Amino acid sequence: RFASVYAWNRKRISNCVADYSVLYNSASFSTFKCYGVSPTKLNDLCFTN
Amino acid sequence: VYADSFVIRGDEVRQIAPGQTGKIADYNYKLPDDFTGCVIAWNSNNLDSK
């Protein structure tokens, strides 16, 4: 289930590790446009909220 | 002049560029960030698709 664009659904992910490489390596995606950050460096970077 | 020729998918020609990523740009063909040249790509779904 995916809510439509007029009611896009938002989730607050916090206080957990997340291997962005598993998303970064899957071929199921077409556009992976990252702004202000590099997808390769998303791994070592520790963000908040 | 050095001409490197290969065949890839339709949504993968964008990967043939400096800085791009994906399976093609990580394990098969890497382009240097200071690359000087051209990247010609054309659809051939009448000669390599059976």
PDB file of N, CA and C in Angstrom:
ATOM      1  N   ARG A   1       0.838  -1.191   0.000  1.00  0.00           N
ATOM      2  CA  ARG A   1       0.000   0.000   0.000  1.00  0.00           C
ATOM      3  C   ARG A   1       0.876   1.245   0.000  1.00  0.00           C
ATOM      4  N   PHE A   2       0.618   2.143  -0.949  1.00  0.00           N
ATOM      5  CA  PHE A   2       1.342   3.406  -1.064  1.00  0.00           C
ATOM      6  C   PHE A   2       0.325   4.529  -1.194  1.00  0.00           C
ATOM      7  N   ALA A   3       0.316   5.435  -0.219  1.00  0.00           N
ATOM      8  CA  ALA A   3      -0.590   6.572  -0.269  1.00  0.00           C
ATOM      9  C   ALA A   3      -0.232   7.479  -1.440  1.00  0.00           C
ATOM     10  N   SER A   4      -1.249   8.110  -2.021  1.00  0.00           N
ATOM     11  CA  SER A   4      -1.051   8.904  -3.222  1.00  0.00           C
ATOM     12  C   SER A   4      -0.244  10.164  -2.909  1.00  0.00           C
ATOM     13  N   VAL A   5       0.115  10.890  -3.971  1.00  0.00           N
ATOM     14  CA  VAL A   5       1.011  12.035  -3.830  1.00  0.00           C
ATOM     15  C   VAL A   5       0.370  13.141  -3.001  1.00  0.00           C
ATOM     16  N   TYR A   6      -0.948  13.325  -3.117  1.00  0.00           N
ATOM     17  CA  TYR A   6      -1.617  14.359  -2.335  1.00  0.00           C
ATOM     18  C   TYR A   6      -1.619  14.043  -0.846  1.00  0.00           C
ATOM     19  N   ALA A   7      -1.369  12.792  -0.470  1.00  0.00           N
ATOM     20  CA  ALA A   7      -1.330  12.360   0.922  1.00  0.00           C
ATOM     21  C   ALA A   7      -0.110  11.483   1.168  1.00  0.00           C
ATOM     22  N   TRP A   8       1.053  11.953   0.717  1.00  0.00           N
ATOM     23  CA  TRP A   8       2.293  11.200   0.870  1.00  0.00           C
ATOM     24  C   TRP A   8       2.538  10.860   2.334  1.00  0.00           C
ATOM     25  N   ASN A   9       2.999   9.638   2.589  1.00  0.00           N
ATOM     26  CA  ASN A   9       3.121   9.148   3.957  1.00  0.00           C
ATOM     27  C   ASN A   9       4.560   9.284   4.436  1.00  0.00           C
ATOM     28  N   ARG A  10       4.728   9.817   5.646  1.00  0.00           N
ATOM     29  CA  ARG A  10       6.034  10.134   6.206  1.00  0.00           C
ATOM     30  C   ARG A  10       6.283   9.305   7.458  1.00  0.00           C
ATOM     31  N   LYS A  11       7.498   8.772   7.574  1.00  0.00           N
ATOM     32  CA  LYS A  11       7.918   8.002   8.736  1.00  0.00           C
ATOM     33  C   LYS A  11       9.224   8.564   9.282  1.00  0.00           C
ATOM     34  N   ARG A  12       9.321   8.617  10.608  1.00  0.00           N
ATOM     35  CA  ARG A  12      10.485   9.152  11.308  1.00  0.00           C
ATOM     36  C   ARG A  12      11.367   7.985  11.742  1.00  0.00           C
ATOM     37  N   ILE A  13      12.442   7.748  10.999  1.00  0.00           N
ATOM     38  CA  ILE A  13      13.404   6.702  11.326  1.00  0.00           C
ATOM     39  C   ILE A  13      14.487   7.314  12.204  1.00  0.00           C
ATOM     40  N   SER A  14      14.703   6.719  13.375  1.00  0.00           N
ATOM     41  CA  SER A  14      15.681   7.234  14.321  1.00  0.00           C
ATOM     42  C   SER A  14      16.131   6.109  15.242  1.00  0.00           C
ATOM     43  N   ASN A  15      17.369   6.230  15.728  1.00  0.00           N
ATOM     44  CA  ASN A  15      17.949   5.317  16.715  1.00  0.00           C
ATOM     45  C   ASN A  15      18.001   3.880  16.191  1.00  0.00           C
ATOM     46  N   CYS A  16      18.694   3.714  15.067  1.00  0.00           N
ATOM     47  CA  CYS A  16      18.966   2.402  14.494  1.00  0.00           C
ATOM     48  C   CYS A  16      20.007   2.560  13.399  1.00  0.00           C
ATOM     49  N   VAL A  17      20.760   1.495  13.158  1.00  0.00           N
ATOM     50  CA  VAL A  17      21.702   1.463  12.048  1.00  0.00           C
ATOM     51  C   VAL A  17      20.952   1.024  10.801  1.00  0.00           C
ATOM     52  N   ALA A  18      21.427   1.470   9.642  1.00  0.00           N
ATOM     53  CA  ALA A  18      20.751   1.170   8.383  1.00  0.00           C
ATOM     54  C   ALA A  18      21.795   1.116   7.279  1.00  0.00           C
ATOM     55  N   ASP A  19      21.997  -0.068   6.712  1.00  0.00           N
ATOM     56  CA  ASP A  19      22.927  -0.239   5.601  1.00  0.00           C
ATOM     57  C   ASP A  19      22.297   0.345   4.347  1.00  0.00           C
ATOM     58  N   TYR A  20      22.653   1.590   4.024  1.00  0.00           N
ATOM     59  CA  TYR A  20      22.152   2.207   2.802  1.00  0.00           C
ATOM     60  C   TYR A  20      22.675   1.510   1.555  1.00  0.00           C
ATOM     61  N   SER A  21      23.693   0.658   1.693  1.00  0.00           N
ATOM     62  CA  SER A  21      24.236  -0.044   0.535  1.00  0.00           C
ATOM     63  C   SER A  21      23.260  -1.078  -0.012  1.00  0.00           C
ATOM     64  N   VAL A  22      22.378  -1.619   0.830  1.00  0.00           N
ATOM     65  CA  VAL A  22      21.411  -2.599   0.343  1.00  0.00           C
ATOM     66  C   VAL A  22      20.394  -1.934  -0.580  1.00  0.00           C
ATOM     67  N   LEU A  23      20.031  -0.680  -0.298  1.00  0.00           N
ATOM     68  CA  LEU A  23      19.211   0.083  -1.234  1.00  0.00           C
ATOM     69  C   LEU A  23      20.045   0.566  -2.412  1.00  0.00           C
ATOM     70  N   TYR A  24      21.310   0.891  -2.152  1.00  0.00           N
ATOM     71  CA  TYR A  24      22.189   1.503  -3.137  1.00  0.00           C
ATOM     72  C   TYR A  24      22.646   0.514  -4.203  1.00  0.00           C
ATOM     73  N   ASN A  25      22.578  -0.786  -3.917  1.00  0.00           N
ATOM     74  CA  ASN A  25      23.022  -1.814  -4.847  1.00  0.00           C
ATOM     75  C   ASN A  25      21.883  -2.470  -5.615  1.00  0.00           C
ATOM     76  N   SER A  26      20.650  -2.377  -5.121  1.00  0.00           N
ATOM     77  CA  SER A  26      19.524  -2.991  -5.809  1.00  0.00           C
ATOM     78  C   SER A  26      19.283  -2.317  -7.154  1.00  0.00           C
ATOM     79  N   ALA A  27      18.982  -3.130  -8.163  1.00  0.00           N
ATOM     80  CA  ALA A  27      18.714  -2.640  -9.508  1.00  0.00           C
ATOM     81  C   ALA A  27      17.246  -2.313  -9.738  1.00  0.00           C
ATOM     82  N   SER A  28      16.398  -2.467  -8.718  1.00  0.00           N
ATOM     83  CA  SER A  28      14.974  -2.200  -8.868  1.00  0.00           C
ATOM     84  C   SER A  28      14.659  -0.722  -9.050  1.00  0.00           C
ATOM     85  N   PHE A  29      15.612   0.168  -8.784  1.00  0.00           N
ATOM     86  CA  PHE A  29      15.396   1.604  -8.877  1.00  0.00           C
ATOM     87  C   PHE A  29      15.927   2.144 -10.198  1.00  0.00           C
ATOM     88  N   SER A  30      15.324   3.239 -10.658  1.00  0.00           N
ATOM     89  CA  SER A  30      15.743   3.907 -11.883  1.00  0.00           C
ATOM     90  C   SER A  30      16.437   5.235 -11.619  1.00  0.00           C
ATOM     91  N   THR A  31      15.859   6.094 -10.784  1.00  0.00           N
ATOM     92  CA  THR A  31      16.479   7.363 -10.421  1.00  0.00           C
ATOM     93  C   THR A  31      16.840   7.344  -8.942  1.00  0.00           C
ATOM     94  N   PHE A  32      18.100   7.653  -8.644  1.00  0.00           N
ATOM     95  CA  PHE A  32      18.666   7.650  -7.298  1.00  0.00           C
ATOM     96  C   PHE A  32      19.344   8.984  -7.015  1.00  0.00           C
ATOM     97  N   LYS A  33      18.633  10.078  -7.277  1.00  0.00           N
ATOM     98  CA  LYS A  33      19.254  11.400  -7.306  1.00  0.00           C
ATOM     99  C   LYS A  33      19.443  11.910  -5.884  1.00  0.00           C
ATOM    100  N   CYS A  34      20.693  12.049  -5.456  1.00  0.00           N
ATOM    101  CA  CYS A  34      21.008  12.520  -4.115  1.00  0.00           C
ATOM    102  C   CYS A  34      21.487  13.964  -4.179  1.00  0.00           C
ATOM    103  N   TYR A  35      20.875  14.821  -3.367  1.00  0.00           N
ATOM    104  CA  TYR A  35      21.190  16.241  -3.317  1.00  0.00           C
ATOM    105  C   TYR A  35      21.815  16.571  -1.970  1.00  0.00           C
ATOM    106  N   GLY A  36      22.965  17.240  -2.000  1.00  0.00           N
ATOM    107  CA  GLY A  36      23.665  17.610  -0.790  1.00  0.00           C
ATOM    108  C   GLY A  36      24.489  16.509  -0.168  1.00  0.00           C
ATOM    109  N   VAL A  37      24.505  15.316  -0.764  1.00  0.00           N
ATOM    110  CA  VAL A  37      25.240  14.176  -0.233  1.00  0.00           C
ATOM    111  C   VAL A  37      25.585  13.256  -1.395  1.00  0.00           C
ATOM    112  N   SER A  38      26.553  12.375  -1.169  1.00  0.00           N
ATOM    113  CA  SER A  38      26.954  11.400  -2.166  1.00  0.00           C
ATOM    114  C   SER A  38      26.489  10.017  -1.748  1.00  0.00           C
ATOM    115  N   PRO A  39      25.878   9.248  -2.652  1.00  0.00           N
ATOM    116  CA  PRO A  39      25.385   7.917  -2.264  1.00  0.00           C
ATOM    117  C   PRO A  39      26.474   6.987  -1.759  1.00  0.00           C
ATOM    118  N   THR A  40      27.697   7.101  -2.280  1.00  0.00           N
ATOM    119  CA  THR A  40      28.792   6.274  -1.782  1.00  0.00           C
ATOM    120  C   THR A  40      29.108   6.598  -0.327  1.00  0.00           C
ATOM    121  N   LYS A  41      29.079   7.879   0.034  1.00  0.00           N
ATOM    122  CA  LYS A  41      29.412   8.316   1.384  1.00  0.00           C
ATOM    123  C   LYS A  41      28.240   8.215   2.350  1.00  0.00           C
ATOM    124  N   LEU A  42      27.067   7.774   1.885  1.00  0.00           N
ATOM    125  CA  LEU A  42      25.927   7.601   2.778  1.00  0.00           C
ATOM    126  C   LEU A  42      26.164   6.509   3.813  1.00  0.00           C
ATOM    127  N   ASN A  43      27.152   5.640   3.597  1.00  0.00           N
ATOM    128  CA  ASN A  43      27.376   4.525   4.512  1.00  0.00           C
ATOM    129  C   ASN A  43      28.024   4.996   5.808  1.00  0.00           C
ATOM    130  N   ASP A  44      29.217   5.589   5.712  1.00  0.00           N
ATOM    131  CA  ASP A  44      29.941   6.002   6.908  1.00  0.00           C
ATOM    132  C   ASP A  44      29.270   7.163   7.628  1.00  0.00           C
ATOM    133  N   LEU A  45      28.457   7.949   6.929  1.00  0.00           N
ATOM    134  CA  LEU A  45      27.833   9.115   7.538  1.00  0.00           C
ATOM    135  C   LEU A  45      26.760   8.690   8.534  1.00  0.00           C
ATOM    136  N   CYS A  46      26.809   9.260   9.735  1.00  0.00           N
ATOM    137  CA  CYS A  46      25.798   9.022  10.759  1.00  0.00           C
ATOM    138  C   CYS A  46      24.944  10.278  10.894  1.00  0.00           C
ATOM    139  N   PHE A  47      23.680  10.176  10.500  1.00  0.00           N
ATOM    140  CA  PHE A  47      22.744  11.287  10.548  1.00  0.00           C
ATOM    141  C   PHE A  47      21.859  11.180  11.783  1.00  0.00           C
ATOM    142  N   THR A  48      21.051  12.215  11.991  1.00  0.00           N
ATOM    143  CA  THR A  48      20.098  12.264  13.090  1.00  0.00           C
ATOM    144  C   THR A  48      18.708  12.544  12.540  1.00  0.00           C
ATOM    145  N   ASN A  49      17.719  11.788  13.023  1.00  0.00           N
ATOM    146  CA  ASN A  49      16.307  12.019  12.721  1.00  0.00           C
ATOM    147  C   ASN A  49      16.050  11.964  11.210  1.00  0.00           C
TER     148      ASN A  49
ATOM    149  N   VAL B   1      43.324   8.067 -30.323  1.00  0.00           N
ATOM    150  CA  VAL B   1      41.922   7.889 -29.971  1.00  0.00           C
ATOM    151  C   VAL B   1      41.723   6.448 -29.532  1.00  0.00           C
ATOM    152  N   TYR B   2      40.940   6.249 -28.478  1.00  0.00           N
ATOM    153  CA  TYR B   2      40.623   4.913 -27.994  1.00  0.00           C
ATOM    154  C   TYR B   2      39.112   4.768 -27.930  1.00  0.00           C
ATOM    155  N   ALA B   3      38.579   3.805 -28.676  1.00  0.00           N
ATOM    156  CA  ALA B   3      37.141   3.585 -28.775  1.00  0.00           C
ATOM    157  C   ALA B   3      36.794   2.303 -28.029  1.00  0.00           C
ATOM    158  N   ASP B   4      36.034   2.439 -26.947  1.00  0.00           N
ATOM    159  CA  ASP B   4      35.589   1.306 -26.146  1.00  0.00           C
ATOM    160  C   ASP B   4      34.117   1.052 -26.436  1.00  0.00           C
ATOM    161  N   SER B   5      33.814  -0.107 -27.014  1.00  0.00           N
ATOM    162  CA  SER B   5      32.471  -0.432 -27.473  1.00  0.00           C
ATOM    163  C   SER B   5      31.900  -1.589 -26.668  1.00  0.00           C
ATOM    164  N   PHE B   6      30.632  -1.467 -26.286  1.00  0.00           N
ATOM    165  CA  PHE B   6      29.947  -2.533 -25.563  1.00  0.00           C
ATOM    166  C   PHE B   6      28.442  -2.332 -25.698  1.00  0.00           C
ATOM    167  N   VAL B   7      27.684  -3.227 -25.065  1.00  0.00           N
ATOM    168  CA  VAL B   7      26.225  -3.216 -25.104  1.00  0.00           C
ATOM    169  C   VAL B   7      25.704  -3.276 -23.676  1.00  0.00           C
ATOM    170  N   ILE B   8      24.756  -2.397 -23.352  1.00  0.00           N
ATOM    171  CA  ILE B   8      24.149  -2.331 -22.027  1.00  0.00           C
ATOM    172  C   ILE B   8      22.656  -2.065 -22.184  1.00  0.00           C
ATOM    173  N   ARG B   9      21.967  -1.940 -21.052  1.00  0.00           N
ATOM    174  CA  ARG B   9      20.522  -1.779 -21.048  1.00  0.00           C
ATOM    175  C   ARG B   9      20.128  -0.341 -21.381  1.00  0.00           C
ATOM    176  N   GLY B  10      18.825  -0.144 -21.594  1.00  0.00           N
ATOM    177  CA  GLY B  10      18.327   1.179 -21.936  1.00  0.00           C
ATOM    178  C   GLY B  10      18.437   2.172 -20.795  1.00  0.00           C
ATOM    179  N   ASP B  11      18.160   1.727 -19.573  1.00  0.00           N
ATOM    180  CA  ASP B  11      18.263   2.577 -18.395  1.00  0.00           C
ATOM    181  C   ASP B  11      19.666   2.590 -17.805  1.00  0.00           C
ATOM    182  N   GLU B  12      20.657   2.090 -18.542  1.00  0.00           N
ATOM    183  CA  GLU B  12      22.024   2.017 -18.060  1.00  0.00           C
ATOM    184  C   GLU B  12      23.003   2.853 -18.871  1.00  0.00           C
ATOM    185  N   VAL B  13      22.563   3.478 -19.966  1.00  0.00           N
ATOM    186  CA  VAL B  13      23.451   4.362 -20.716  1.00  0.00           C
ATOM    187  C   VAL B  13      23.787   5.601 -19.899  1.00  0.00           C
ATOM    188  N   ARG B  14      22.874   6.031 -19.026  1.00  0.00           N
ATOM    189  CA  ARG B  14      23.163   7.146 -18.132  1.00  0.00           C
ATOM    190  C   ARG B  14      24.304   6.831 -17.176  1.00  0.00           C
ATOM    191  N   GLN B  15      24.587   5.548 -16.944  1.00  0.00           N
ATOM    192  CA  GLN B  15      25.687   5.167 -16.069  1.00  0.00           C
ATOM    193  C   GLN B  15      27.046   5.406 -16.708  1.00  0.00           C
ATOM    194  N   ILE B  16      27.098   5.575 -18.026  1.00  0.00           N
ATOM    195  CA  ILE B  16      28.375   5.779 -18.729  1.00  0.00           C
ATOM    196  C   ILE B  16      28.630   7.281 -18.712  1.00  0.00           C
ATOM    197  N   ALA B  17      29.199   7.745 -17.603  1.00  0.00           N
ATOM    198  CA  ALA B  17      29.503   9.152 -17.379  1.00  0.00           C
ATOM    199  C   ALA B  17      30.383   9.276 -16.142  1.00  0.00           C
ATOM    200  N   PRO B  18      31.242  10.292 -16.064  1.00  0.00           N
ATOM    201  CA  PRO B  18      32.087  10.446 -14.870  1.00  0.00           C
ATOM    202  C   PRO B  18      31.242  10.749 -13.641  1.00  0.00           C
ATOM    203  N   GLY B  19      31.486   9.996 -12.570  1.00  0.00           N
ATOM    204  CA  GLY B  19      30.796  10.185 -11.315  1.00  0.00           C
ATOM    205  C   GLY B  19      29.561   9.331 -11.120  1.00  0.00           C
ATOM    206  N   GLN B  20      28.998   8.779 -12.191  1.00  0.00           N
ATOM    207  CA  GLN B  20      27.805   7.958 -12.060  1.00  0.00           C
ATOM    208  C   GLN B  20      28.139   6.622 -11.404  1.00  0.00           C
ATOM    209  N   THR B  21      27.097   5.951 -10.915  1.00  0.00           N
ATOM    210  CA  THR B  21      27.252   4.700 -10.192  1.00  0.00           C
ATOM    211  C   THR B  21      26.199   3.709 -10.677  1.00  0.00           C
ATOM    212  N   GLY B  22      26.189   2.537 -10.061  1.00  0.00           N
ATOM    213  CA  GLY B  22      25.427   1.397 -10.524  1.00  0.00           C
ATOM    214  C   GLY B  22      26.341   0.253 -10.931  1.00  0.00           C
ATOM    215  N   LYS B  23      25.719  -0.905 -11.167  1.00  0.00           N
ATOM    216  CA  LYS B  23      26.490  -2.116 -11.442  1.00  0.00           C
ATOM    217  C   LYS B  23      27.469  -1.911 -12.591  1.00  0.00           C
ATOM    218  N   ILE B  24      27.021  -1.250 -13.662  1.00  0.00           N
ATOM    219  CA  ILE B  24      27.896  -0.991 -14.801  1.00  0.00           C
ATOM    220  C   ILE B  24      29.071  -0.118 -14.380  1.00  0.00           C
ATOM    221  N   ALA B  25      28.797   0.934 -13.613  1.00  0.00           N
ATOM    222  CA  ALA B  25      29.817   1.902 -13.235  1.00  0.00           C
ATOM    223  C   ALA B  25      30.621   1.486 -12.010  1.00  0.00           C
ATOM    224  N   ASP B  26      30.302   0.352 -11.389  1.00  0.00           N
ATOM    225  CA  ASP B  26      31.070  -0.145 -10.254  1.00  0.00           C
ATOM    226  C   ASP B  26      31.856  -1.410 -10.550  1.00  0.00           C
ATOM    227  N   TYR B  27      31.359  -2.290 -11.421  1.00  0.00           N
ATOM    228  CA  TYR B  27      32.022  -3.564 -11.655  1.00  0.00           C
ATOM    229  C   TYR B  27      32.449  -3.800 -13.096  1.00  0.00           C
ATOM    230  N   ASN B  28      31.938  -3.036 -14.060  1.00  0.00           N
ATOM    231  CA  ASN B  28      32.199  -3.315 -15.468  1.00  0.00           C
ATOM    232  C   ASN B  28      32.996  -2.211 -16.149  1.00  0.00           C
ATOM    233  N   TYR B  29      32.528  -0.967 -16.101  1.00  0.00           N
ATOM    234  CA  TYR B  29      33.141   0.132 -16.838  1.00  0.00           C
ATOM    235  C   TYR B  29      33.153   1.370 -15.957  1.00  0.00           C
ATOM    236  N   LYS B  30      34.345   1.864 -15.642  1.00  0.00           N
ATOM    237  CA  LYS B  30      34.516   3.069 -14.843  1.00  0.00           C
ATOM    238  C   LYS B  30      35.127   4.172 -15.694  1.00  0.00           C
ATOM    239  N   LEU B  31      34.569   5.375 -15.581  1.00  0.00           N
ATOM    240  CA  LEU B  31      35.038   6.530 -16.327  1.00  0.00           C
ATOM    241  C   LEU B  31      35.707   7.520 -15.388  1.00  0.00           C
ATOM    242  N   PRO B  32      36.935   7.943 -15.677  1.00  0.00           N
ATOM    243  CA  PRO B  32      37.626   8.871 -14.777  1.00  0.00           C
ATOM    244  C   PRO B  32      36.936  10.224 -14.722  1.00  0.00           C
ATOM    245  N   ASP B  33      37.110  10.909 -13.588  1.00  0.00           N
ATOM    246  CA  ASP B  33      36.469  12.204 -13.393  1.00  0.00           C
ATOM    247  C   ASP B  33      37.019  13.274 -14.327  1.00  0.00           C
ATOM    248  N   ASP B  34      38.246  13.107 -14.824  1.00  0.00           N
ATOM    249  CA  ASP B  34      38.851  14.041 -15.765  1.00  0.00           C
ATOM    250  C   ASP B  34      38.792  13.526 -17.199  1.00  0.00           C
ATOM    251  N   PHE B  35      37.744  12.782 -17.541  1.00  0.00           N
ATOM    252  CA  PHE B  35      37.666  12.149 -18.849  1.00  0.00           C
ATOM    253  C   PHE B  35      37.350  13.184 -19.922  1.00  0.00           C
ATOM    254  N   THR B  36      38.106  13.143 -21.016  1.00  0.00           N
ATOM    255  CA  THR B  36      37.918  14.039 -22.154  1.00  0.00           C
ATOM    256  C   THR B  36      37.605  13.186 -23.375  1.00  0.00           C
ATOM    257  N   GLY B  37      36.387  13.313 -23.891  1.00  0.00           N
ATOM    258  CA  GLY B  37      35.979  12.501 -25.028  1.00  0.00           C
ATOM    259  C   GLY B  37      34.490  12.599 -25.273  1.00  0.00           C
ATOM    260  N   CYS B  38      33.944  11.543 -25.872  1.00  0.00           N
ATOM    261  CA  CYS B  38      32.527  11.477 -26.198  1.00  0.00           C
ATOM    262  C   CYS B  38      31.967  10.131 -25.765  1.00  0.00           C
ATOM    263  N   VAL B  39      30.663  10.101 -25.500  1.00  0.00           N
ATOM    264  CA  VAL B  39      29.960   8.875 -25.124  1.00  0.00           C
ATOM    265  C   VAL B  39      28.766   8.752 -26.067  1.00  0.00           C
ATOM    266  N   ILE B  40      28.938   8.003 -27.152  1.00  0.00           N
ATOM    267  CA  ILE B  40      27.879   7.786 -28.126  1.00  0.00           C
ATOM    268  C   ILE B  40      27.097   6.548 -27.717  1.00  0.00           C
ATOM    269  N   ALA B  41      25.774   6.652 -27.728  1.00  0.00           N
ATOM    270  CA  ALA B  41      24.912   5.534 -27.375  1.00  0.00           C
ATOM    271  C   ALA B  41      23.693   5.536 -28.281  1.00  0.00           C
ATOM    272  N   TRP B  42      23.298   4.351 -28.744  1.00  0.00           N
ATOM    273  CA  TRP B  42      22.132   4.251 -29.609  1.00  0.00           C
ATOM    274  C   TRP B  42      21.395   2.943 -29.362  1.00  0.00           C
ATOM    275  N   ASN B  43      20.069   3.005 -29.464  1.00  0.00           N
ATOM    276  CA  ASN B  43      19.234   1.824 -29.297  1.00  0.00           C
ATOM    277  C   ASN B  43      19.383   0.901 -30.500  1.00  0.00           C
ATOM    278  N   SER B  44      19.526  -0.393 -30.231  1.00  0.00           N
ATOM    279  CA  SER B  44      19.703  -1.403 -31.267  1.00  0.00           C
ATOM    280  C   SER B  44      18.794  -2.595 -31.007  1.00  0.00           C
ATOM    281  N   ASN B  45      17.524  -2.327 -30.713  1.00  0.00           N
ATOM    282  CA  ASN B  45      16.562  -3.408 -30.494  1.00  0.00           C
ATOM    283  C   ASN B  45      15.974  -3.900 -31.813  1.00  0.00           C
ATOM    284  N   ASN B  46      16.862  -4.182 -32.766  1.00  0.00           N
ATOM    285  CA  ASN B  46      16.502  -4.900 -33.977  1.00  0.00           C
ATOM    286  C   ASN B  46      17.627  -5.791 -34.479  1.00  0.00           C
ATOM    287  N   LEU B  47      18.772  -5.821 -33.797  1.00  0.00           N
ATOM    288  CA  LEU B  47      19.918  -6.618 -34.229  1.00  0.00           C
ATOM    289  C   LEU B  47      20.556  -7.440 -33.122  1.00  0.00           C
ATOM    290  N   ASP B  48      20.388  -7.077 -31.849  1.00  0.00           N
ATOM    291  CA  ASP B  48      20.970  -7.820 -30.737  1.00  0.00           C
ATOM    292  C   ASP B  48      19.904  -8.365 -29.794  1.00  0.00           C
ATOM    293  N   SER B  49      18.649  -8.403 -30.233  1.00  0.00           N
ATOM    294  CA  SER B  49      17.545  -8.920 -29.429  1.00  0.00           C
ATOM    295  C   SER B  49      16.792  -9.949 -30.260  1.00  0.00           C
ATOM    296  N   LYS B  50      16.840 -11.205 -29.831  1.00  0.00           N
ATOM    297  CA  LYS B  50      16.178 -12.304 -30.518  1.00  0.00           C
ATOM    298  C   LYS B  50      15.011 -12.813 -29.682  1.00  0.00           C
TER     299      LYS B  50
END
